[PDB]
Amino acid sequence: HMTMEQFLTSLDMIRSGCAPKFKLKTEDLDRLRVGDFNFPPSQDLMCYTKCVALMAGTVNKKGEFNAPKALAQLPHLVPPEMMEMSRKSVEACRDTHKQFKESCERVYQTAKCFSENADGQFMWP
Structure with a gap:
């Protein structure tokens, strides 16, 4: 398992392996x-x-999205x-991807669904 402290730090480590592949705005990542x-994504x-x-x-x-x-x-x-x-958000958003055909949109829309269904603070790397 991970602690809350390891979780918050993992967010930056995960970002570091993905952000360099793209042209991104810091203010977008912050949000x-x-x-x-x-806000509209690129x-x-x-x-x-x-x-x-x-x-x-x-x-x-x-x-x-692979719910199980x-x-x-x-x-x-x-x-x-x-x-x-x-767990609650996985269940609510498991079928979000079926409404979209393109792979990046599928994931983004599912992540957005997570953020919207989160009954607490939600954080993306």
Whole structure:
């Protein structure tokens, strides 16, 4: 498992493996970091979210969200304090990806759904 302290630091480590692949605005990343997905994303920002989810092993390369695998991965992704919120959001957003065809959009829309269904503070790497 991870502690809250390890979680908050993991956010930066995850970002470091994905951000360099894209052209991104710091203010966009700042907003996603606090779960504010309330602004139009660029293609780059959407594909950044796919890179993050791919690292997490929660989507495939087609951006299809894998709910059972996400649930299995949660202890490697969030601290105990965030487990139930995350469980609830996986359940609410498991089918979000089926409304979209393009892989980066599929992941971005699912992440946005997580942020919107989060009954507490939501943080994206």
